[PDB]
């Protein structure tokens, strides 16, 4: 039969009022012969009717995939409401049901530290700017970089890692032309998490 997977919003989207957070229900292994799929959505048991269901799409393995998207309220997701997706298709015995909500546990505030590139990395044309983010719970977090008002995109961030006290840490790495570092340009690491004031903090890094 088909299979159902249910996905939370992006951390940033739940935390920042400029964004629109959504919960996503993906039905896979839908057969060519019966591809009709219905969705029903619920919030703390109460049915809601604002979901938008995509048109089915064929796969490179002869099967279909159907995706439904539900827009949610930031405050609801943050305050622990539960979201249920129910999926209906003839090739099932009965409807499949899946529920999600924000990770549980006592929140703890991230500490954010910027680390300049090593002296030994200066033999290179590009250098690494580092942002250490530690001591946070739950693990849902977003990290970005800017310079001079504008986003910097040439970064990669590790997944959250469990630390010895049961909190989480990660590191983000921004790669920049050595020119820009040595010219004295100012960079910033921005961190979004539920246990920060405004859900947001920014730390600078420069020569």
């Amino acid at each position: 039969g088909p299979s159902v997977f249910l996905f939370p919003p992006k951390p940033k989207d739940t935390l920042m009022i400029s964004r629109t957070p959504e919960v996503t229900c993906v039905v896979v292994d839908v057969s060519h012969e019966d591809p009709e799929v219905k969705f029903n959505w619920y919030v703390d048991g109460v049915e809601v009717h604002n979901a938008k269901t995509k048109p089915r799409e064929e796969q490179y393995n002869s099967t279909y995939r159907v995706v439904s998207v539900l827009t949610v309220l930031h405050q609801d997701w943050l305050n622990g409401k539960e979201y249920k997706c129910k999926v209906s298709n003839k090739a099932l015995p009965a409807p499949i049901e899946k529920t999600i909500s924000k990770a549980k546990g006592q929140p703890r505030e991230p500490q954010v530290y910027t680390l300049p590139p090593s002296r030994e990395e200066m033999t290179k044309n590009q250098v690494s700017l580092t942002c250490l983010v530690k001591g946070f719970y739950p693990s849902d977090i977003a990290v970005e970089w800017e310079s001079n008002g504008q986003p910097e995109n040439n970064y990669k961030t590790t997944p959250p890692v469990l630390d010895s006290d049961g909190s989480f840490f990660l590191y983000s790495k921004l790669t920049v032309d050595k020119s820009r570092w040595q010219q004295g340009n100012v960079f910033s690491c921005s961190v979004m998490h539920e246990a920060l004031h405004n859900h947001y903090t920014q730390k600078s890094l420069s020569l």
Binding site: M16, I17, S18, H74, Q75, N79, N198, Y200
Partner: peptide, 14 residues
Amino acid sequence: FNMXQQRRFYXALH
């Protein structure tokens, strides 16, 4: 993003 709207959101969350 708009920082004053973010601050109002966080202050009003409940």
